[PDB]
């Protein structure tokens, strides 16, 4: 049983008055909001469930709410009103997603919100119900009022954003007590002049943490408690914690202008001489056992912590009263450490260690951690096991491209089913004055997409300006204008060989397999693809997937991508039996890898492969110079720099093995050389 | 090296816990009153520190109202009820609550109730049922083996004629607006919410008390008897409805002694 | 007498270097803003620069600007003082007197076609290298 | 209505930020557009904006111009907010109804698609004629399916309306049956749709009991449609965007697509499923005309088979006589041939006739409330009874044959046998109710049985352990990992393993799951009628709350009647029943202007 | 990753209904399990129901005890802590793992909700702020090591 | 917070030191005292006029215990209200204005004071020689035994263990160092 421990009632009513009388000093940022709508009180006041307030985080997330509730709260903070970004912007937003397609196009230099369409967007007039009152009490904290106005502002406040429920009636309870206690205590000296919201806001945030309980000090169960002055009761076992020098003895200085402190009295009293006599009483009331535990040895860098002064004279008194009868006459000072370092126990950093449950003096009562200081347990298996796979019929295309996009990932996710779920990210605190990462690459796909029919860049920019995913004023101007740059660069070699193709039908059967699919885009000149990214093996993988599924079935014709900064990966037209060939390997590679997990690694075994292949020979080399370079690439493409994130850093190779060992890594160069080998052998 | 770990042969610890009586189980009107634990309360503290020779003043009223939160516009009926409550005697002979003098009156009398034997239901519910007319029906509660002490805090002992009596108030009455609680009801409800053990050990409680500080005591010369006040069922016209006077049997209490005691 | 120590200070230096970028970097017009963003991509890029700065003791700046010049004035003098030099340019344009030695190619006359092409607009900031060419401390020990 | 006049925040909200700073009669406007659309109404005509608004005049003294903006269309479009459909305004006011933008797009996109889309595929007619006698046996007198598998068969675009009990999936086996017969050597990927999951398994299981009586052949039996999906897994919906898979660009690769249950298809996902559809997939359209109207904001199935009551054309009626080879009746004028040719009515239905008072009832209630009262009156039919449910005497009287009908299900459970034929006592008899809260509602019915059963001696229930042995329970969300769908019934007993749920699977097997295994778990004593879509009950009983709601009106008492097979119990007023049925959930919509011309 | 490991059983104990997040916490390193193992628990319907029963009373005692008595009733009843004590190496993750269950139950205290305690730990996860109680720990201090 | 600070040291005064506020009220300052007097007195006084303004009561815990002290001493006959006896269980620490209200408190009604001191000697300091005498002219007597016992070990050597200032030398070095609350309240 603990006891004089603080009272913690109802933290989520407290706080959240807390945060409601901090409205006007608050930045409106959306996780406050979030964090506010959290609580089931302030929720069920808005009529807000739980599904509501999941749609609503990322309804929040992706219209583009950041900070500032109103314009006029832009203004306040002697900010330039920009407009978009606030709370307002993503409120028309939502209303215009509500009532207008995002195909349409901009109307009030707004684009609208696809996502909020049908009546779940009925919770968002909720929402909007919600900041509104937000706003209220923002204009009616600010201005300072005398005592006698202060009375009902928390009653109104408690019955405007609150609900009265069952179990925090007693909250919302005692915050009226204390606000009238603090009005009386206020108006019994009838102060007449003005006082401002921030001190009461104080002193309510200290009167309501003031509460302790001490009702369960003797009930039956051993007592958990501080020690508390001029209360000595005689126990037959006694044990103090938290003994050490700094936390005991608890000083508190005096004010400095206290008159008292500079010629002391008989009748004075301060907090040192009371934990000492505490200490003392301490000392004589224990009965039976007393027991003294301090933190001798630091956990964060092994530091010896000294005990505190009283612990430190008794200990001494101890050394210096008495002696041991295995050294009746040796020395006194050697007696006295003997004595000292025989009561002193150094118990164990971790409780798995072995000593201490070899029999002896001290012996640990936890048989759970028996097993684990026994050293007879089974070690982990390897998970790599033959597991039995059999070949079916129809096998598509589309299944052979997401095995040979990831084959760990293909082997996790659909043999297995495991498919390791992370959390989505949390939205960001500011507008985006940068572009980097998926929303720059989809911005420059859309603007390749457009630049690919020669439509009006203008329009995609106030498209992409009305959402607020560019930059305000002129820094977005500069990035459209560096990105339509590029994608003017690379359309000038995209539509430069392009011709109208429409998509065709794969069906094919091979080694008894039949192979159903579809290929979008056939050319008569061939495979057409643009993609704005960087020169990769895993799109090279995949155009020659494609390349194999297109000409196996007649199509004599090139195979020709085009990445960024003059990449291009070409295939030359081959023949039937060839094509017919490398999809049956294609299909052992696909049958190999759901039995056991097929390690073929598609960039770092690419590099170490272009490192080792030569294309002028048809031949691998074999000196040490080349076998050195391609270490050094399988290395550079599977743990990557500081700036770019390696190959290595994933989750689907660290569950396999933690550290890449060598034979592993040869593993893989010899499935890279034997599946990656056509990749490099017809490229052009 | 081999190790082993040491095992616990028995028990750590019996059933130690000092419990309570808790642990071990028109458009204006006193019926139309907010029924909850909090308005119970805020009439058991009006009534605690209200005098009962004074008459009520409604300022008085309306500034008690006001620290505790309620509407305005009940205090003119609920002072009147007030009054109508403390002009109701309850009493066999008709004893008002204003002929109670200051030291008379003993208002919120805790105790502390030792026993050191393991409380088993099965033997005191069947010593309850031997005496107490009222444990017809009500199936046994099921409680733990209960050794140490027990709290409790009496609402209201007072002395009349040279004859101790023990008053306690009850007033959530939720389900009642008309002027059905009559004794059937009253004592439907005292056998639904088991408030027969609560008044059996204050019984006991104030046995053990007069015993202690009165010296040549005797049970059935000054104890007189024990009065509910239920206070939403006072009527002006009914003076039977709202109060529930019970007296033991005067053999329960000493055998429930040598029960608490050894 | 009573106050709260925090210990992680870079939240709230990160929320003002965003706040001095959005009331000085927004109003900024196009040609300004360009020199703005060849300076610094953003805010983050400018608080990476004067974090060693902010924190502790503030150093004194060596020949500080003036406190009424602002942004434009800067500007405003750089393009007039690029435009006195493209002025001078376009006046002793045409005529060739050095004498032309062993490390002076011949083709200088085509980095005088890329300074006539380069006198368009003074919108740009960065003028050509072929200006290095004609320097009289260079060209005299060429 | 009552509910419009109280305002949602979601509209007031609209009109304060679409309007702003221009008149109050564009915010009026707004405000009660969206009060519509939120209730259900597509467009909002402006002669109820001019007629039933008080403050009509005071907006017409609040604005001031030249021409004074007399006219409402006048002050709309001065506003930038509204537009005659070329700006891009978010409302748009095109035929003297203003809407929104996307209810506009969608509305001309669905007119643009049963329009204009609809051609007809002219096949040989021989082959066809002696595929539907080889088919149907019955060539003596009119037989509504065939002439409805031959206006599917022949037209791209076909809808077919029906109401339960008419043979609705023979129909489609004969018209896939016939489909195939008639084009051999072409293939044909046969793809079926469902909006929700449960009447997909139970389109999966009629399909399969039906399609494995007609004789097929090896070939014909591969092309045999597996499955039937979701409408939001069949175009590819995801949890967190709205983007499809097949949106605009790429189409389902689908020669023939049967859409089973078309009255539960809102506007938004009949335009999702329009855009997804290639120039070539003929549709075949499933679902009752009387039935209840959509979830969302729309009305589409209604809207599309108001027309089917005008008949066929003078044209199509001579092709219908000269592909079924019998005398189809011809449709006095024409107005939109190709919608009238597409569409159907099947009025012969076979499993209930004129001797059972269900078809007559349901046949009554698209009727005036009095034929209702004459259907009821006479003789019962030994079918329908009604129970006056007016006082707590009555509730007594409503729980008493409530245990009535449960009676062979507690006999089969107090007796401890099979959980199969438990199950299947459980399935004859179930409770219809309108609300969810409240004394007439799902929980509070759901609780007052609870209570019923530990009063009298037939169901032991332990307060805290909430998993007594015979409770049911549904589950109210999709799980395809346990194979339980949205309205499924399940019984928890002890086998002598512990308490676990069994359910019925439609393969004719049982399921026993753990109470820890289930996602959701509500009590089902008592089934909302909108929730109870889909399934069949041999004892149905309705029990409509005395307080006047918009929920009760003609189409739910119609599918109230038709959720009975046999036996059907009223627990209403009079004055409730015969305000139920005169109130018809009107929708206003543009597509009675646009089919029109 | 003894981090996000500790996430998903933490939402396999929150949910463990839904069989995917159960099935992807079943297959960290944390518990070690073969292909095989998991193959036949994907199999058997029994084992899979013995396991989402421990769950629900491994919810049970962490809605009822806390953070510390559930995790130490899951290291006890699966035995993780003595393989992760056979294996060499799994030391230091043993360590992390304890860390982590200390910083959990010192952060759970402080809320009063079960589903702010995950996301908390998620905020964490995507904060890579180093406090002075959040920094990694020496593994070991028996055996000798070269120390950098 | 300068409100709140002064408000809590003129408590303290008010509990411990009621000579410097009997002296403020007047409005003379009290010589050996520190420099915050100098706005210490000022501010005291003002207050007492402040309530004097005001329709607040006079009288505080300061100005009564004199008068407490004289009204009991002077009376004759026994106020009616008075409690038969009073104890005092479990408290170690009072200050001389509770202890001197409490002797003329006793004088009428017999107090009952429970003092636990882990000493059985005197182990408090002392204040004159004329005062040590005066101790040692003082025996305590048991409650069952009803045998004097005298205070010190040693009687004639009792000086001997006094310094010059009056500080005892405690032998045990832990009652001398931890136990000065008790050493000034056995004094």
Same mark, same amino acid.
């Given at each position: 049983?603990?006891? !004089?421990?603080? &009272?913690?009632q109802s ?14 000093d ?18 069920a ?10 749609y ?42 509500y ?5 349409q196009?901009?109307? /009030? ?9 049908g009546?779940?967007?009925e919770?968002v ?8 009152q *937000?706003n209220?009490?923002? +204009?009616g904290?600010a ?11 928390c009653?109104?406040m408690?019955?405007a ?11 919302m309870?005692?915050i009226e ?8 205590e ?5 102060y007449g002049?003005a ?6 806001r ?16 003797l ?15 005689p126990?037959?076992?006694?044990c ?10 608890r ?18 009293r ?15 009331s ?14 964060q860098?092994?530091s ?6 009283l ?9 210096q ?5 295995? !050294? ?24 798995? !260690?072995?000593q ?10 936890a048989?759970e951690?028996?097993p684990?200081?026994?050293q007879?347990?089974k ?10 796979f059999?070949?079916?019929?129809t096998?598509?295309?589309?299944t ?7 084959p ?5 996710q ?9 959390? !989505? ?8 004055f ?11 796909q859309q ?25 305000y ?9 560096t990105?339509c ?11 430069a060989?392009r ?10 059967? @091979? ?15 061939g495979?057409?693809?643009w ?13 020659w ?20 900064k ?6 030359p ?15 052992e ?11 073929v ?14 294309? /002028? ?5 074999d ?6 370079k ?6 550079? #493409? ?11 850093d ?6 396999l ?5 060598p ?8 499935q890279s050389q ?11 | ?10 028990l750590p ?10 642990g ?19 009439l058991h ?20 109202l006001?620290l505790?939160?309620?509407?305005? /516009? ?7 009820w007030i ?9 066999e002979?008709?004893?008002?609550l ?13 105790f502390?109730?030792p ?32 050794r ?12 009349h004629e ?5 008053? #306690?108030?009850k ?21 639904a ?10 019984? *006991?409680?104030?046995h053990?008390?007069l ?6 005591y ?8 024990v009065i509910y ?9 009914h ?24 | 007498?009573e106050?709260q ?6 939240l709230?230096?990160?929320?003002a ?6 009331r000085?970097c ?7 803003a360009?020199?703005v ?7 983050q ?18 020949a ?7 942004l434009?004035?800067?500007h405003?003098?750089i393009?007039?003082?690029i ?12 005529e060739l ?13 085509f ?27 260079s060209?005299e020990?060429? | ?10 509209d ?18 707004? &405000?009660?557009?969206?009060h ?5 109404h ?18 017409a003294?609040?604005?001031?111009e ?8 006048? @002050?709309?479009?001065?506003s ?11 409302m ?14 969608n ?28 088919l ?9 399916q ?5 206006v599917?068969?022949?037209?791209r675009?076909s ?18 049956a ?12 046969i ?24 004789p ?10 597996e ?6 897994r ?42 997804a ?7 075949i ?5 009387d039935?209840?109207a ?6 589409v ?5 108001a ?24 449709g ?16 012969k ?58 009676? +062979? ?15 299947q ?5 179930? $409770?219809?109710?309108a ?9 509070g019915?759901?609780e007052?049985?609870e209570?019923?059963?530990?009063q ?17 329970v549904m ?12 309205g ?8 002598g393993?512990?308490? +676990? ?9 049982i399921?026993?799951?753990?109470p ?13 009628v ?11 009983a309705?029990i ?8 009760v009106?003609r ?16 627990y ?26 | 990753?003894?981090a ?25 390193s944390?518990?070690?399990?073969? &292909? ?12 899979w ?25 899951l ?12 294996? #060499? ?27 702010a ?31 950098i | 917070?300068?409100s ?37 007195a ?12 005001l329709?607040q009561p006079?009288?505080?815990?300061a ?29 170690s ?25 882990? @000493? ?8 004159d ?11 305590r +007597?048991?409650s069952?035994?009803?045998?004097? $016992? ?13 310094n ?14 931890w136990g ?8």
């Open positions: 049983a603990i006891s !004089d421990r603080r &009272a913690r933290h989520p009513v407290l706080e959240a008055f807390i945060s409601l009388l901090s409205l006007p608050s930045r409106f940022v959306s996780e406050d909001v979030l964090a506010l709508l959290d609580v089931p009180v302030l929720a006041r808005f009529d807000i469930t739980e599904e509501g307030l999941r609503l985080r990322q309804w929040v997330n992706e219209s583009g709410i950041r900070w500032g509730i109103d314009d006029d709260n832009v203004r306040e903070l002697e900010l330039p009103a920009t407009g978009q970004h606030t709370w307002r912007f993503g409120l028309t937003r939502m209303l215009l997603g009532a207008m397609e995002s195909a196009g901009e109307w /009030q230099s707004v684009l609208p919100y696809d996502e909020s369409s009546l779940i967007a919770l007039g909720h929402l909007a119900s919600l900041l509104m *937000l209220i009490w923002r +204009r904290l201005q300072e009022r005398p005592l006698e106005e202060w009375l009902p502002v009653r109104d408690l019955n954003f609150f609900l009265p429920d069952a179990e925090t009636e007693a909250a309870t005692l007590q204390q606000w009238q206690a603090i009005i009386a206020g108006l019994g000296a009838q002049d006082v401002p919201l921030s001190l009461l104080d002193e309510l945030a200290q009167r309501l943490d003031q509460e302790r309980i001490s009702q369960r000090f009930a039956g169960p051993v007592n958990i408690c501080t020690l508390m002055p001029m209360r000595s009761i126990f037959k076992v006694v103090l914690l938290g003994m050490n020098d700094g936390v005991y003895p000083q508190l200085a005096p004010l400095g202008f206290d008159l008292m402190s500079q010629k002391p009295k008989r009748g004075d301060s907090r040192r001489d009371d934990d000492r006599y505490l200490f003392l009483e301490a000392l004589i224990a009965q039976q056992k007393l027991y003294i535990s301090y933190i001798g040895r630091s956990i860098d092994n010896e912590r000294f005990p505190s002064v612990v430190q004279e008794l200990i001494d008194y101890i050394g009263s008495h002696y041991l009868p295995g !050294d009746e006459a040796l020395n006194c000072d050697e007696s006295e450490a003997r004595v000292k370092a025989h009561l002193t126990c150094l118990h164990t950093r971790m409780p798995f !260690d072995p201490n449950y070899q029999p002896g003096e001290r012996q640990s009562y048989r951690w028996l684990a200081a026994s007879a347990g070690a982990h298996s390897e998970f790599v096991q033959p597991l039995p059999t070949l079916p019929e096998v598509p295309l589309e052979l491209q997401r095995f040979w996009a990831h760990v990932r293909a082997f996790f659909m043999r297995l089913q495991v498919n390791f779920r992370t959390e !989505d990210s949390e939205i960001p605190d500011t507008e985006p940068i572009l980097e990462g998926l929303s720059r690459y989809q911005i420059n603007l390749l997409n457009a630049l690919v029919e020669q439509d009006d860049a203008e329009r995609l920019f106030r498209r992409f300006r009305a959402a607020g995913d560019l930059p004023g002129a820094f977005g101007e500069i990035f459209w204008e990105q740059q590029e994608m003017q660069q690379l359309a000038d070699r995209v539509i060989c011709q109208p193709g429409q998509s065709m039908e794969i069906d094919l059967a @091979c080694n008894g397999v039949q192979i159903t699919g579809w290929l979008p885009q056939v050319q008569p000149d495979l057409l693809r993609r704005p990214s960087l020169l990769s093996v895993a799109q090279g993988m995949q155009l997937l494609e390349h194999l599924v297109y000409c196996a079935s007649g199509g004599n014709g090139e195979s020709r991508l085009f990445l960024r003059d990449g291009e990966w070409r295939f037209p081959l023949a039937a039996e060839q094509a017919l060939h490398y999809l049956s390997q294609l299909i590679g696909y049958r190999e890898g759901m039995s056991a997990p097929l390690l690694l598609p960039e770092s075994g690419g590099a170490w492969l272009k490192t080792c292949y030569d294309a /002028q020979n048809d031949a691998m080399l000196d040490d110079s080349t076998l050195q391609a270490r050094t690439k399988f290395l550079q #493409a599977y743990e990557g720099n500081m700036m770019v994130r390696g190959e290595g994933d989750i689907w190779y660290q569950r093995w933690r550290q890449l060992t034979e592993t890594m040869e593993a893989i160069v010899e034997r599946f990656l080998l056509p990749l490099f052998r017809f490229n052009q | 090296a081999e190790l082993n770990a040491k095992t616990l042969q028995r610890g019996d059933n130690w816990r000092v419990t309570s009586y808790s071990l189980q028109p458009t204006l009107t006193p019926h139309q009153f907010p029924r909850g634990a909090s308005p119970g309360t805020f503290s009006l009534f605690e520190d209200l005098d009962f020779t004074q008459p009520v003043d409604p300022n008085w009223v309306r500034e008690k006001e505790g939160g309620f509407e305005s /516009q009940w205090e003119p009926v609920l002072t009147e009054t109508a409550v403390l002009q109701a005697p309850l009493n002979t008709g004893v008002s204003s002929q109670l003098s200051a030291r008379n009156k003993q208002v919120e009398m805790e502390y109730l026993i050191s034997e393991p409380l088993i239901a099965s033997q005191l519910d069947t010593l309850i049922r031997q005496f107490d007319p009222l444990s017809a029906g009500c199936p046994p509660l099921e409680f733990m083996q209960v140490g002490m027990l709290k409790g805090f009496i609402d209201l002992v007072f002395r040279g004859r101790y009596y023990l008053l #306690a108030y007033s959530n009455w939720l389900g009642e607006d008309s002027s059905a609680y009559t004794q059937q009801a009253m004592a439907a409800a005292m056998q919410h088991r408030y027969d053990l609560q008044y059996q050990l204050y019984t *006991l409680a104030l053990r008390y015993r202690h500080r009165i010296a040549d005797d049970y059935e010369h000054h104890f007189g008897g006040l239920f206070l939403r069922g006072v009527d002006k016209e003076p039977q409805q709202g109060i529930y006077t019970t007296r033991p049997n005067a053999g329960l209490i000493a055998l429930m002694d040598e029960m608490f005691a050894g | 007498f106050q120590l925090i210990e992680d200070e870079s709230l230096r990160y929320q270097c965003a706040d001095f970028w959005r000085h927004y109003p900024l017009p196009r040609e300004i360009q020199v963003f060849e300076t610094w991509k953003g805010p890029a400018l608080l990476r620069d004067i974090n060693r700065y902010l924190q502790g003791e503030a150093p004194v700046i060596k500080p600007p003036p406190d009424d010049e602002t434009a004035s800067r405003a003098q393009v007039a003082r435009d006195t030099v493209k002025q001078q340019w376009r006046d002793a344009v045409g007197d050095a004498l032309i030695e062993s490390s002076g190619i011949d083709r200088r006359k980095n005088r076609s890329n300074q006539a092409k380069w006198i368009d607009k003074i919108s740009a900031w960065a003028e050509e290298e072929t200006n290095s060419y004609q320097l009289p401390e060209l020990k060429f | 209505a009552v509910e419009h006049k109280q305002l949602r925040p979601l007031v909200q609209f009109a304060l930020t679409v309007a702003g700073d221009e008149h109050p009669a564009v915010t009026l406007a707004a &405000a009660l557009l969206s519509d659309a939120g209730e259900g597509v467009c909002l005509p402006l002669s109820r904006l001019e007629n039933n608004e008080a403050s009509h005049p005071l907006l003294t609040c604005v001031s030249i021409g004074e903006l007399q006219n409402w269309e006048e @002050c709309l479009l001065a930038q907010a509204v537009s005659r459909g070329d700006e891009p305004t978010p748009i006011l095109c035929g003297d109804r203003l809407y929104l933008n996307r209810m506009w797009c509305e001309r996109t669905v007119a643009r698609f049963f329009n204009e889309v609809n051609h007809a595929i002219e096949v040989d007619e021989a082959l066809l004629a002696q595929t539907l006698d080889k149907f046996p019955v060539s003596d007198e009119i037989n509504w065939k002439v409805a598998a031959a599917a068969l022949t037209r675009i809808v077919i309306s029906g109401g339960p009990g008419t043979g609705k999936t023979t129909t489609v086996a004969k018209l896939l016939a489909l195939i017969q008639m084009a051999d050597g072409e293939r044909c990927r793809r079926l749709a469902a909006p929700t999951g449960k009447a997909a398994a139970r389109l999966t299981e009629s399909l399969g009991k039906a399609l494995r009586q007609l097929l052949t090896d070939e014909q039996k591969k092309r045999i449609p499955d039937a999906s979701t409408l939001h069949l175009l590819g919906a995801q949890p967190g965007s709205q983007r499809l898979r097949h949106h605009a660009g790429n189409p389902l690769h689908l020669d023939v697509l049967v859409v089973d249950e078309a009255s539960m298809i809102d506007l938004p996902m009949m335009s999702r499923l329009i855009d559809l290639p120039d070539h997939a003929r549709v359209f499933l679902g009752d005309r039935q209840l959509s979830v969302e904001a729309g009305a199935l209604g809207d599309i088979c027309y089917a009551n005008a008949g066929f054309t003078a044209e199509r009626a001579r092709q219908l006589s000269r592909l079924t080879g019998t005398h189809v009746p011809a006095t004028g024409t107005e939109a041939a190709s919608l009238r040719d597409s569409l159907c009515l099947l009025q239905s076979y499993r209930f006739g004129s001797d059972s008072g269900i078809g007559q009832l349901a046949a009554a209630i698209n009727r005036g409330d009095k034929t209702a009262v004459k259907t009821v009156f006479q003789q019962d039919f030994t079918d329908i009874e009604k129970r006056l449910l007016q006082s707590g005497e009555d509730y007594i009287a409503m729980l008493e044959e409530a245990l009535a009908g449960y009676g +062979r299900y507690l006999d089969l459970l107090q007796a401890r046998a099979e959980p199969d034929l438990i199950i006592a459980f399935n004859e008899y179930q $409770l219809l109710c609300l969810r809260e409240g004394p007439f509602g799902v929980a019915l759901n007052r049985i209570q019923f059963m530990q009298k001696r037939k169901i032991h229930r332990h307060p805290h352990s909430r998993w007594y042995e015979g409770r049911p589950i109210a969300r999709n799980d395809s990992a346990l194979g339980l769908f949205n499924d019934i399940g019984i928890a007993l002890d086998r393993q512990g308490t +676990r749920v069994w359910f019925a699977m439609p393969d004719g097997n399921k026993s799951v753990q820890s295994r289930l996602p959701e778990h509500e009590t089902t004593w008592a089934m909302t909108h929730k109870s879509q889909g399934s069949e009950f041999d004892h149905a309705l409509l709350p005395s307080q006047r709601t918009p929920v009106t189409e739910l008492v119609y599918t109230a009647v038709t959720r009975a097979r046999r036996r059907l119990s009223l209403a007023d009079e004055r409730i029943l015969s305000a139920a049925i005169a109130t018809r959930t009107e929708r206003r919509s543009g597509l009675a202007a646009l089919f029109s011309s | 990753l003894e996000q490991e500790m996430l998903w059983l933490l939402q396999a104990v929150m949910t463990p209904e839904r069989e995917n997040t159960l099935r992807s916490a079943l297959a960290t944390m518990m070690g399990l073969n &292909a095989l193992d998991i193959e036949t628990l994907n199999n058997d319907e029994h084992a129901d013995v396991v989402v029963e421990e769950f629900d009373g491994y919810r049970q005692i962490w809605r009822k005890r806390g953070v510390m008595p559930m995790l130490r009733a290291m006890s009843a699966r035995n993780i802590a003595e393989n992760l004590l056979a294996t #060499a190496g799994g030391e230091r993750r043993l360590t992390d793992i304890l860390h982590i269950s200390e910083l959990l139950q010192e952060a759970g205290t402080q809320l009063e909700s079960e589903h305690l995950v996301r908390w730990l998620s905020q964490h996860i995507l904060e890579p702020d180093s406090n002075a109680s959040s920094q990694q720990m020496r593994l070991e201090s028996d055996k000798h090591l070269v120390q | 917070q300068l709140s600070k002064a408000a809590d040291l003129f408590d303290q005064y008010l509990v411990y030191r009621p000579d410097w506020l009997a002296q403020w009220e007047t409005g003379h300052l009290v010589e050996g005292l520190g420099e915050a007097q100098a706005w210490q000022p501010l005291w006084k003002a207050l007492v006029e402040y309530t004097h303004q329709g006079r009288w505080h815990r100005n009564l215990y004199q008068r407490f002290i004289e009204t009991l001493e002077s009376a004759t006959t026994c106020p009616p209200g008075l409690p038969s006896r009073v104890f005092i269980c479990g408290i620490a009072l200050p001389p204005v509770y202890l001197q209200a409490l002797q003329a408190l006793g004088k009428h009604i017999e107090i009952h004071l429970l003092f636990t001191n882990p @000493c059985r000697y005197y182990w408090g300091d002392i204040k020689p004329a005062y040590l005498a005066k101790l040692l002219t003082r025996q +007597r048991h069952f035994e009803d045998r004097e $016992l005298p205070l010190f070990r040693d009687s004639e050597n009792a000086g001997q263990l006094f010059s200032d009056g500080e005892q030398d405690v032998g045990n070095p832990l009652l001398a160092s000065k609350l008790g050493r000034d309240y056995i004094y």
